[PDB]
Design a protein around this ligand. Structure first.
Ligand code: HEC
Ligand code: HEC
Ligand code: HEC
Ligand code: HEC
Ligand SMILES: [Ca+2]
Ligand SMILES: [Ca+2]
Ligand code: NA
Ligand code: NA
Ligand code: NA
Lengths: 126, 376, 359, 131, 376, 354
């Protein structure tokens, strides 16, 4: 398929694909693939309130957005639509941009197992 | 044509453009309907496993349920809940064993009951749907115990408690016919009828022996609780149909899935869930293919469809993939579900024509069991 | 008309003749040189403001009028969450409903009634001209119309660009005219990845066109009573500020102790903080949030008093799910947030930043 | 690689699914996760229960009873998985049935399935399955 | 030549023909040695996971250890035990969380300790080896915590008890240098030295800032405890070396893994464990490939081998597979282990020539972490 | 050598002149018509035998001599398990060391000493000739050489094909000459898949050339005392039969209550069962194993008595790892097991199967 080392090319036409522009720093599985959606958690799982950010280029409007990702927690890993992108991803000592961390904090019932990640926008980037 | 992912990209791009705000939250799954399908992944004996809840119409995963070691899923025909008998250990696959039943709300998927089974009494085996079963009124769960002897466990889902074990003879599988009654299949070739009061031993009656010693009946019979129809293929595709609707076992005329000719050219059923039964259509579906007599657990590429009443073949479908398990929705114009363990993919077919409509890939590690609610 | 109405409100806004003893105008408490808040000292410092009678103190801190005009009218959304309104408890529907209230409040401008208010407007020849041109002849003779017309004028003036200019460094940075300092940028990244963003951002997702750093909801963050202010106001040692529950028509006991999330625009210059003015320093308000997250003893000590924060005035309906984020702000992230919130200061108040720590 | 074809036993590689003794093996050949043909890997517990099958041995054309035994108390190895069913009968003839987790008698009550050994315990035939 | 399964078939045939008897039993793993290699499989965030204990010389799996959610494995350098900090939940991935440490006998693989950690204190993160660490004497296991603030947990392996949490600055990773001392890397670009007692505020000291805010130091630096050498690449294959063998941090000269022409042609490190350090040889092994700058976690197909003192390149190996992680045996004529998360295969190479020697496949779902004991 | 020696042993085996009163021979208790066990009714039924004095009863059941020559000589193997030897407690090393003991045992044949034995050998001109030809002139005038020579003749005699003919139906089936009945084959299958194969097979794996349905180990299966046999033995109600621990040399407490795994050959016709004859029926002996696995009330009841089995004579060193198999033998498997065991009957005792 893709040359994995090639520069990531965003698209704005399929949210289940690993090159969907909002997933530029996703790590894990797309929630849309296990019964969530782009910005919602699947039934039974618990929404984290922690997030990490990236500035993701949206080739639809030429604008870069801040995507503050959020984990859906308390389920085993969905195993569907796995992806790992790291645009602007910084190491763990810049946790506000670091994406190996299980960002499940604040999830209800202290859920801390990783199920999938959602990609909501929270601002415009500069 | 437009995929669910594409349509989603478009609605997101639209919300963005219109400046439409939405609260990130926990979705509810769409109400159970007849086209909802559950795929259980026993994961080739992995210590934890997954159940996939799938909208069969959209070919979309609408939810998931985590399980332990070889859990037995059950699905209430009326769609009001799901449950499983499961098994965990305090250190992944080692240490203290806990068998338990969970009952789940079928839209929030939240567990509504977690009932401990004392003395780790579950039968640990490659998943046989009919090794754990709901009584018709959904108030009781019965599970099989092999060790130290065949026994059956009675779990009250209403009082959310385990009651006791029933001592049975040398028999297998559990097909509930009533709040207090289930049949089992016996080594001597009979069925045992088990009626349990609140206390006492149960009262156990035997049918006549209904197959010789060298006729092998598969581990995955179809049973329609609402039809009382136990459909039981043997290795050659000979199919026993037993009617348990009267409360007692009526034996239907024995039917043949493959022609005497076909059987001569090496046609035999094979797979996991080799048989499905559609209640309203009174129709038997059988995974078969050409195979050596002892390759009976292998994937099959073809499905035969036969009238339960007569044995007339209605269709023969080249499935187009290696299929291990089939089942069907119980609505009119059913889906035929063809699950490939090897592909970890549910292929969703039109049951009338056998054409492939859509599919759901990435269903775990070795998915094997398909369940559907019979909601009609 | 929309220029003239606003201009008539600009006149009323600064007019002390709308208070009983003629000592007090809106501008007295909502002082334009202080981002429309009250610089004056009272029995409880700057926590609460003193009325026209020279004696009466309110029980809540005087909030800025800056950006107040961006708040939606009060309403319940579909998720059953109350949003918008004016006053810390949302008991006014909108600016126009709020405006006549200080006028008749014996603890504030203390006019006895609408007629005393109309009688004042009638005394001033420019008002007769200004009002009559906007509302028609004889408007001032009808105390109901005069009062409502004044409320409308006052609402309109507060809706002008002068109250919401969006000319903060943050605004300038979001235009691309400039950039944040590294501290500000880190502050900003924290603010939007941490729990603040769950309440102090207009939207749950996507981008706000005129961000004012509040979602207009009601949350009980579990603040204690401000003792000196509560003494000063005289409401009683047994009095409970119920927040939103005090709005008439709200009966739901789950609303007790919930207050309107303030806009963080000009937060740097409008101390002290919270609905009762309880914390003097911007840093302290931010530090309060660590009480739900940190496991360090100091997390529980108000740094301004060296004593525990205090029992919540209202212990129930705490926004725990949002507040108990599981992550504590270290002092680096606290400094960052201060610097970031300083970027929310309007251009004309930037010189005020200087004194307050730094900028 | 034709999964439906009659199984062609070989006596040259025990880690392959067509090894002669694995003729009714189900799971994972122990020899792939640190056991051997007839020994359990470390950390696992050898069950006393077995299922049996008469497996034909290409080499000497003799048929041998293989009493498969499970090594239990670990998550499934994931290595050299195999499923053959020569002579395999359904669960009501449990002695020849191979979906069953034959972990009974394992120390510490271990009942989770890790892998299966294939030792010989007899040179005999069955009525249902003779050569 | 003769594969291991062919050798085994021959030997069993000979035992059969010879009437040789033998008792079926539980094997001991062979004695830990320099070519033992552990591969941990975080399984892409699965709730349960596996570690494969591998004889690197034979390329044979000699054993396995089960774990829970994103366990942190450690291997005592002297070969006396292995351990991990692990996390389970009462209902698979839901319910009561128990963090715990197991210590295991390295030949029976039996756990010889199971130490609960109170208040579920582990950092749940994609596996970084240096987020949980053994002190040099093997007596204490230190584990990083992120929530609510950066912190470090002290576990007494010898008394088989958890001790306490240490409060640290905004810093990351744990490199022990002594029974009571470790270094962390801080957000501000320094190292923090943490000296701790049983009780008391730890002694925390910072080095000077040793990199600018825009050089990014990777999550998988190689640390040789016996050498006190912390080998820390940046995104560009710039390598920071820090010598901590005096007990305080001395900064070694920066070396470039890649040439300027290579860097101008898009060469950069990438993978998971991107760097290996051979103690006796004082050699750095870096996984590199041509890649965009933000593709830094993708596999790489090349290893550069450079002298650590001079930064002279000694080799550029063409690995021949998509390698995510590397590591080396610490003996003479070391093996270069090259783990493909994608292939789930440990390729085992001659570290001198780079030639592939053998490989071990079927190592779980998403294996990522190679650990070797430095036993010399 | 072999031929004549064994023929000498055949003479001695049936000679009552080797008992004090001249009333008993090996054959009396080891009756060739009863698979070399004791048909004679005593105080304790057939549980124990009566010595030459007509009053002394043993404390253990007389085992078959059939197949005893296949047992290895007593030894500790490398895993630390004791194996082989003769007697239920292994106290004799082999058949030769065992042969002399009944002769001089006062509860059995009761000769006073090797000398009185030799005197008896001397009264018989035929012994004079038979012994002299194999062991040399004057052998019988030396009581030591006389007694050893006798014992050796007996041992040789027990090693002839006549004691171990391998002509049972089981042997014929394993030669491909005959088939097992369904029930028998079910039996064999159950026997080799259930815990039985763990003690009653020669080998752990591989095929045994001369299977005798015993690994020659020692196990405490947890049997109670046989009250009446113990009564008749006169050893006292205080007495504890410590089994293998009673062999001299064995000091290890873990061996207490352990007995040699009997060969199951001819089992169907050498009732009653176990070291003490406590169970008269073979079905019972098999049911006893359910006490460790079954949870059903009946599994704790000996079906011969209607009462609880009894606490073990030795409630220590039970082989629990083997006996607690987690699986229960239903009626069917017990039937099948009985069926299978009956196939281990030598051809010549096939008529006895009643
Ligand atoms: C001091 C005695 C005041 C004078 C004179 C005026 N205001 Fe005021 N204002 C004051 C307080 C103590 C409060 C909060 C009281 C509460 O119950 O919450 C307010 C609030 C407002 C608001 C709402 C702003 C918001 O909720 O964010 C508005 C729009 C407002 N005040 C405007 C206003 C006008 C138009 C005035 C002259 C008529 C005026 N205020 C006088 C303190 C005092
Ligand atoms: C809802 C759960 C909130 C979260 C999370 C945060 N804030 Fe907040 N903030 C909130 C309310 C309801 C109020 C008013 C409370 C009252 O009763 O008075 C506040 C107030 C502030 C202030 C003072 C502003 C002013 O007085 O004008 C500051 C400086 C503030 N909040 C900052 C802040 C930060 C930095 C947060 C993330 C750590 C944060 N808040 C979270 C509601 C909520
Ligand atoms: C009844 C009074 C007996 C006479 C006469 C003989 N034997 Fe015997 N034998 C008898 C008993 C009660 C026992 C078991 C005693 C014990 O302590 O366990 C035996 C045992 C043997 C054995 C061992 C068989 C085995 O362990 O499987 C042998 C080989 C044996 N006996 C041989 C034997 C010979 C050669 C005799 C004539 C000299 C003889 N027995 C007489 C009962 C009686
Ligand atoms: C080791 C733990 C054993 C297992 C498991 C089985 N048997 Fe056994 N058997 C064993 C011993 C040590 C003994 C003698 C015990 C004593 O002290 O007397 C026995 C005895 C029998 C007998 C009696 C034979 C005779 O008296 O000559 C029978 C019929 C028997 N055993 C059969 C049997 C079956 C069918 C089993 C599986 C259900 C079985 N045994 C298990 C040793 C062990
Ligand atoms: Ca204020
Ligand atoms: Ca006997
Ligand atoms: Na105060
Ligand atoms: Na109210
Ligand atoms: Na002794």
């Amino acid at each position: 398929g893709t040359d994995p080392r090639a520069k990531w090319v965003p698209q704005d036409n399929d949210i289940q694909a690993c090159d969907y522009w909002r997933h530029c720093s996703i790590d894990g599985n797309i929630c849309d693939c296990s019964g969530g959606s782009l910005t919602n958690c699947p039934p039974g799982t618990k929404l984290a309130t922690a997030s990490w950010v990236a500035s993701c280029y949206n080739p639809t409007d030429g604008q870069s957005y801040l995507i503050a990702y959020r984990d859906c927690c308390g389920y085993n890993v969905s195993g569907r639509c796995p992806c790992l992108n790291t645009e602007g991803e910084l190491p763990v000592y810049r946790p506000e941009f670091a994406n190996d961390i299980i960002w499940c904090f604040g999830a209800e019932d202290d859920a801390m197992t990783y199920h999938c990640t959602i990609s909501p926008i929270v601002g415009k980037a500069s | 044509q437009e995929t669910q992912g594409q349509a989603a990209a478009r609605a997101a791009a639209a919300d963005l453009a219109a400046g439409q705000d939405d609260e990130p939250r926990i979705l509810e799954a769409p109400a159970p309907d007849a086209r909802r399908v559950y795929v259980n992944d026993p994961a080739h004996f992995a210590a934890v496993t997954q159940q996939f809840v799938i909208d069969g119409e959209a070919g979309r995963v609408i939810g998931m349920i985590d399980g332990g070691f070889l859990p037995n899923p059950v699905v209430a025909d009326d769609g009001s809940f799901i449950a499983h008998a499961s098994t965990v250990f305090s250190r992944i696959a080692r240490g203290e064993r806990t068998d338990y039943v969970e009952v789940f709300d079928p839209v929030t998927l939240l567990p509504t009951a977690d009932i401990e089974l004392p003395d780790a009494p579950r039968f640990l085996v490659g998943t046989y749907p009919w090794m754990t079963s709901l009584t018709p009124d959904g108030k009781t769960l019965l599970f099989y115990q092999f060790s130290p002897a065949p026994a059956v466990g009675v779990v009250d889902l209403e009082g959310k408690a385990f009651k006791r074990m029933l001592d049975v003879p040398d028999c297998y599988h559990i097909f509930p016919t009533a709040p207090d009654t289930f049949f089992m299949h016996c080594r001597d070739g009979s069925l045992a009828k088990v009626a349990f009061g609140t206390e006492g031993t149960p009262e156990i009656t035997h049918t006549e022996v209904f197959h010789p010693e060298d006729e092998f009946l598969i581990n995955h019979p179809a049973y329609s609780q609402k039809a009382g129809r136990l459909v039981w293929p043997t290795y050659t595709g000979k199919i026993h149909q037993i009617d348990l609707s009267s409360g007692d076992a009526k034996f239907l005329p024995a039917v043949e899935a493959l022609t005497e000719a076909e059987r001569a050219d090496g046609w035999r059923p094979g797979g996991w869930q080799q048989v499905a039964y559609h209640r309203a259509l009174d129709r038997i579906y059988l995974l078969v293919d050409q195979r050596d007599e002892w390759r009976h657990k292998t994937a099959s590429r073809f499905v035969v469809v036969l009238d339960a009443k007569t044995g007339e073949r209605l269709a023969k479908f080249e499935m187009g993939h290696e299929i291990d398990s089939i089942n069907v929705s119980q609505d009119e114009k059913p889906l035929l579900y063809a699950l490939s363990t090897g592909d970890k993919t549910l292929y969703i077919h039109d049951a009338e024509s056998g054409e492939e409509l859509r599919s759901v890939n990435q269903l775990g590690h070795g998915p094997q069991v398909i369940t559907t609610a019979d909601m009609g | 008309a929309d220029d003239a109405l606003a201009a008539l409100g600009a006149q009323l806004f600064v007019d002390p003749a709308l208070s009983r003893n003629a000592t007090q105008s809106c501008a007295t408490c909502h002082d334009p040189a202080r981002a429309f808040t009250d610089p004056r000292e009272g029995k409880a410092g700057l926590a609460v403001s003193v009325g026209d009678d020279g004696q009466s103190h309110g029980d809540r801190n005087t909030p800025t009028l800056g950006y107040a005009a961006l708040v939606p009218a009060f309403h319940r959304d579909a998720n059953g969450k109350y949003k918008g309104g004016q006053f810390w408890d949302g008991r006014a529907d909108d600016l126009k409903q709020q405006a006549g209230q200080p006028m008749l409040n014996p603890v504030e401008m203390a006019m006895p009634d609408r007629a005393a208010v109309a009688a004042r407007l009638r005394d001033d020849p420019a008002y007769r001209t200004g009002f009559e041109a906007l509302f028609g002849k004889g408007v001032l003779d009808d105390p109901e119309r005069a009062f409502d017309a004044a409320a409308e004028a006052l609402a309109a003036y507060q809706a002008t660009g002068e109250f919401s200019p969006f000319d903060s460094k943050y605004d300038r940075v979001m235009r691309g005219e400039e950039k944040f300092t590294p501290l500000e940028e880190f502050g900003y990244t924290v603010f939007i990845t941490w729990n603040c963003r769950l309440c102090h951002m207009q939207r749950k997702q996507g981008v706000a066109e005129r961000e004012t750093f509040t979602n207009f909801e009601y949350h009980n963050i579990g603040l204690p009573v401000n003792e000196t202010a509560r003494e000063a106001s005289g409401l009683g040692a047994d009095h409970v500020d119920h927040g939103l529950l005090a709005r008439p028509g709200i009966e739901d006991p789950a609303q007790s102790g919930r207050f309107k999330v303030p806009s963080l625009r000009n937060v740097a210059v409008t101390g002290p903080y919270m609905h009762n003015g309880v914390f003097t320093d911007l840093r302290t308000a931010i530090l309060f949030y660590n009480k739900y997250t940190s496991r360090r003893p100091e997390a529980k000590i108000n740094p301004e008093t060296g004593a525990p924060w205090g029992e919540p005035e209202v212990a129930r309906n705490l926004s725990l799910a949002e507040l108990q984020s599981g992550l504590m702000l270290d002092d680096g992230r606290v400094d960052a947030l201060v610097a970031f919130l300083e970027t929310l200061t309007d251009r004309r108040y930037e010189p005020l930043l200087e004194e307050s720590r730094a900028a």
